[PDB]
Write a protein that binds this ligand. Structure first.
Ligand SMILES: Cn1cc([C@@H]2O[C@H](CO)[C@@H](O)[C@H]2O)c(=O)[nH]c1=O
Ligand SMILES: Cn1cc([C@@H]2O[C@H](CO)[C@@H](O)[C@H]2O)c(=O)[nH]c1=O
Ligand SMILES: [K+]
Ligand SMILES: [K+]
Lengths: 307, 307
């Protein structure tokens, strides 16, 4: 519907990936390749929602530094509405810098994301009515605990989908599971939140039971080669095997996952079929060089899934 | 004079400096600080010329990638005329990525500068008449040998000041010294060009004699703690001691040097006094965090020099 839109609250980064063509020198500047790409979990999810055909508004923060403007401009080009993003007077725009291998393997990564703290409850409250009229809200855990609490306290019965981002950053959701419609942790995040070891497939039922006892509506638990375990507090649960994928670069798979889950909810799709769809979204991120595959589309995901 | 302008032909980079706050992990992404800054020897010199009060036009190349646009936009903000810069359809904009230490020390550097080869003789010839009406031309040795040869062959009696950039890239000037008005090598560059060891102060006279025998008009030879040796083919030569400087970050000192030399030539200043002025330009770059000190100005350099 032409007035239906989705609101994403999370980080917008410039990802910088550099690798040397040959063996590193340290004692010299080495000819290599350097790529600047848009990143940040929330920004990536928003771009994926746009590619999936939703009107997606990003609520985020960048500095005033020209490169922050390029970030916002490029994310607009892919379909995202960036007009409510906060510009932070004279601040570095967040970035995530990785040194990769001559063969594409990670070495060391620096992340500089303090301006995520500029995504305050005060900022979000300036868009209260807009947020409260979205079809769904996606929040990432890069934002502060106070900002996440504000979203969950003021969602006004709009479902909030939460991306835990990392084992470090996920813990702010632990006491607010009863306010979250859908949570999408990996194995380490679910172990970290629950305090229960996930040693194998046999352990997911007791971990899911812990999440539901603490009030979580829906769990979408990614278990790597084991596939995805999904669980609804009303009783439905199940496993979905992974989709055989030729993996090109792993970055952005979970951001595509989350977009697929939220897009399918907005489109009226049932839970289990939404999890399988989102697995196909992630598969298209996995088979692409960039962290957002610009061939992400409803049509392209369905064809992948039918295989 | 309101129609006097200077033309700079060289590289425009995004410099990316990242350091971890603490000891590196490799096995993790480390919280740290990441800074994006305009760079590239030719772009830096142009910005310094603008700060020194000259109308400076940059002839350079960036890709179409939003971040290339931010580069050009920011360089305009400091006074540089960027309207003739070549945009390269769908190309990475050049970058220079350094991993710095928790204490500011260099570790490893990647440079990605192949689009410097887009600064072709064909491109430059589209601005032949404009180039041939500049008061002075500054070229860096990031550009190809064919492009440098084009500039030196078509300068039409406009003086060409050449920045050798590095020991690797300087060698393209060796056979064209008789076409260069002023060359500004450091000790390793002058050793590399001449084939003569510069073991100490006692060796500069024979190295300068080699440059003049091969047709170089003016040599400005930086010898580190020994200061600067200058030499004119017509017979004047001398040493200028370094200016005591509280060094904050070494990047951009030579770019300020070159700007001071070319600015002083355009302003009518004699050779020896122009070398001492340019030493003060470099001193202000050295005492600044960024690779271009935005307090660079004629007034601020003179006051530094009188001390
Ligand atoms: C270490 N890190 C990384 C990110 C981003 O994740 C995306 C891939 O999903 C990349 O584009 C990064 O910019 C983040 O948002 N928060 C965080 O802590
Ligand atoms: C390794 N390297 C570095 C540069 C630039 O030098 C400036 C400082 O003077 C920095 O801004 C770099 O971007 C260059 O132009 N050509 C080259 O080969
Ligand atoms: K990818
Ligand atoms: K500096």
């Amino acid at each position: 519907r032409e007035k239906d839109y989705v609101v994403i609250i999370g980080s917008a980064n410039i990802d910088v990936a550099g690798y040397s063509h040959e063996s590193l020198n340290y004692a010299d500047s080495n000819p290599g390749k350097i790529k600047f790409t848009p990143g940040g979990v929330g920004r990536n999810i928003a771009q994926n929602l746009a590619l999936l055909g939703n009107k997606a508004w990003l609520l985020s923060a960048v500095g005033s530094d020209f490169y922050g403007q390029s970030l916002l401009t490029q994310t607009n080009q892919s379909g995202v509405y960036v007009d409510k993003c906060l510009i932070v007077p004279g601040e570095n725009t967040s970035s995530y810098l990785s040194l990769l291998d001559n063969t594409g393997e990670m070495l060391v990564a620096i992340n500089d994301m303090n301006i995520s703290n500029a995504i305050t409850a005060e900022y979000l409250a300036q868009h209260r009515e807009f947020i409260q009229r979205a079809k769904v809200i996606v929040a990432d855990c890069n934002i502060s605990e106070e900002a996440l609490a504000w979203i969950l306290d003021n969602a006004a019965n709009v479902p909030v989908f939460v991306d835990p981002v990392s084992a470090w950053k996920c813990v702010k959701v632990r006491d607010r599971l009863n306010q979250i419609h859908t949570l999408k942790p990996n194995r380490l995040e679910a172990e970290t939140l629950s305090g229960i070891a996930l040693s194998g497939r046999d352990d997911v039922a007791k971990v899911a039971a812990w999440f539901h006892q603490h009030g979580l509506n829906r769990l979408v638990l990614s278990m790597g080669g084991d596939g995805v375990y999904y669980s609804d507090i009303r009783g439905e649960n199940g496993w979905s095997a992974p989709i055989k994928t030729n993996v090109i670069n792993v970055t952005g798979a979970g951001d595509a996952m989350m977009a697929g889950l939220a897009s399918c909810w907005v489109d009226g799709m049932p839970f289990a079929e939404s999890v399988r769809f989102a697995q196909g979204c992630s598969s298209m991120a996995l088979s692409c060089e960039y962290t957002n595959n610009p061939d992400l589309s409803i049509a392209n995901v369905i064809s992948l899934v039918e295989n």
